[PDB]
Amino acid sequence: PVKVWGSIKRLT
Amino acid sequence: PVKVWGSIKRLT
Amino acid sequence: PVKVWGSIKRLT
Amino acid sequence: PVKVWGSIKRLT
Amino acid sequence: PVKVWGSIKRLT
Amino acid sequence: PVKVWGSIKRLT
Amino acid sequence: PVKVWGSIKRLT
Amino acid sequence: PVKVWGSIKRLT
Amino acid sequence: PVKVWGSIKRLT
Amino acid sequence: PVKVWGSIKRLT
Hints:
Chain A has 12 residues and is mainly β.
């Protein structure tokens, strides 16, 4: 499986 | 800020 | 930034 | 297998 | 086999 | 055999 | 963009 | 950018 | 979009 | 043999 982790700042 | 985490098993 | 890593066995 | 590595900055 | 190559910039 | 061709531009 | 190409002998 | 490379033996 | 075309043989 | 033609991801 491909795992992802973290956070972005602006949605658009 | 939007936190992102999880996993994908298929590409497309 | 969202870190991504891993491998997939099937395309679709 | 299809390997993935890196980070995304954009959600959409 | 099905070969893949490139990079993704956006999550979805 | 079944041939494949195209492109994925999004991760999920 | 991730390019996809090749051939598979069975769909599953 | 998330780098993607490799090969898969089955489509679905 | 991923295009698919060809013929399907069996394991026999 | 059983021939196939089309796309994995339907367009509009």
